[PDB]
Symmetry: C3
Subunit: 128 residues, 3 copies
């Protein structure tokens, strides 16, 4: 199956090929400084069309906290197959636990795709 | 396949493919900066056999409410299916905040449970 | 399908799993004290060889916040099949929101396996 990827501009680092199944590192599109106890949506400089029936999950890297002192505010980001527009760029929602500087090109998070959940009928009941 | 849902009361907003599903606050919940509260979602559910639920914030949850989910991602097992097994969102407030009854606060999907696997102890890898 | 598990030493409480595919709790390998607003990588005292083509995901137990006042700084840890060396021990990255103590043996996080994402073609495009 395939992913189509548009970059914000020619200066964004092209990302890893995916012929092995490993999660794929995504990078800051520009310098971002965040003060302690402040929040920033860090641009990742990438828009994607994911295979039909799939979604992507985004979490921080293992060394993200050590190096940058940030947590991801939504825990795990979900990118649906439908977020496939030419302006549908990806962002890492960063809350800083300490004063920090993130530089353009720094790897800041990682993503993989997964099959979206199957067809389900929700049915209300009065008692389990 | 089917999920059976019981709602806490008649006032809870009935929920609603493949997309993750929005869950909502069952009552008003005020949380001060640096304080924690379990936010009731006013739903109990009987998931399909051999499936579990995963619960994460919505993308806009932090912008709108200034809360983070303290367990990162909640796992609701197939076996949490009793009549009193209502779901909760564990919220830590990074600023003073006010959640209102009915506000969408998190979202869930189901996923097949891990395969049968045997843990074997070895003294070296 | 199996997982090979090596323990740090004899004093580590062996980890049992449920026949059903429940997530599996892991424990702290030693007594760890963490101050408010400090970070510690909490050793779990286990190294594992996961089945081929699988990865593990590590999240906190629902009760970890209430019992120990810590969040997991990477949201959800990804353990690849490749992290199967004799000194590839697993850790829970903990940030304390209050002064806390975690005891040796305490069940603090939980894991399951999942198949790795399938081989996919990343293909750059000028517009979506
Ligand atoms: O974010 C979550 C996570 C879990 N639960 C439900 C399912 C869970 O079984 C119960 C509380 O479980 P527990 O007995 O505290 O521990 P365990 O998670 O091993 O069941 O709450 C939630 O409502 N929200
Ligand atoms: O929550 C976690 C996340 C990962 N690891 C392990 C697996 C990982 O391989 C190693 C850190 O190595 P890395 O090379 O910084 O990251 P990765 O292997 O994720 O690229 O720590 C943990 O013990 N706990």
């Amino acid at each position: 199956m395939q992913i189509k990827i548009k970059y914000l501009d020619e200066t964004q680092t092209r990302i890893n090929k995916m012929e092995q199944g490993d999660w794929i590192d995504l990078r800051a599109a520009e310098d971002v400084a965040i003060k302690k106890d402040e929040f920033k949506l860090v641009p990742l400089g990438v828009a994607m069309e994911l295979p039909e029936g799939y979604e992507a999950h985004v979490v921080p890297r293992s060394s993200t906290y050590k190096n940058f002192g940030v947590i991801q505010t939504n825990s795990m980001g979900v990118i649906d197959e439908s977020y496939k527009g030419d302006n549908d760029f990806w962002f890492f929602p960063a809350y800083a636990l300490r004063d920090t500087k993130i530089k353009k090109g720094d790897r800041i998070c990682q993503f993989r795709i997964m099959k979206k959940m199957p067809a389900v009928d929700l049915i209300e009941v009065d008692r389990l």
